[PDB]
């Protein structure tokens, strides 16, 4: 996307009713900080929620 929200007015969105493919999350290592707590950063593609 082009724009984001403020820290105080953080935008909340619901994700469901679709297939989640987080390949792009780690394929494009353009994010300075990428940390997962309680879930494997690499196994994100082998989980259901």
């Amino acid at each position: 996307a082009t724009r984001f929200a403020s820290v105080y007015a953080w935008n909340r969105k619901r994700i469901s009713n679709c297939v989640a493919d987080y390949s792009v999350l780690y394929n494009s290592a353009s994010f300075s900080t990428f940390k997962c707590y309680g879930v494997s950063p690499t196994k994100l593609n082998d989980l259901c929620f």
Binding site: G38, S40, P41, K43, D46, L47
Partner: protein
């Protein structure tokens, strides 16, 4: 194993192992005491017979 990486999965598994081992030791001690009581009862029954 799936949620957490080996670093902290090690301590989590260690805690689970400690708890389960404590439960097993308590159960085995109780079983030993009960077995001693039943052996005394069986000796009494054999003497009566």
């Amino acid at each position: 194993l799936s949620r957490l990486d080996p670093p902290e999965a090690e301590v989590q598994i260690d805690r689970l192992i400690t708890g389960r081992l404590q439960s097993l030791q308590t159960y085995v001690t109780q079983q030993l005491i009960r077995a001693a009581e039943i052996r005394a009862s069986a000796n009494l029954a054999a003497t009566k017979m």
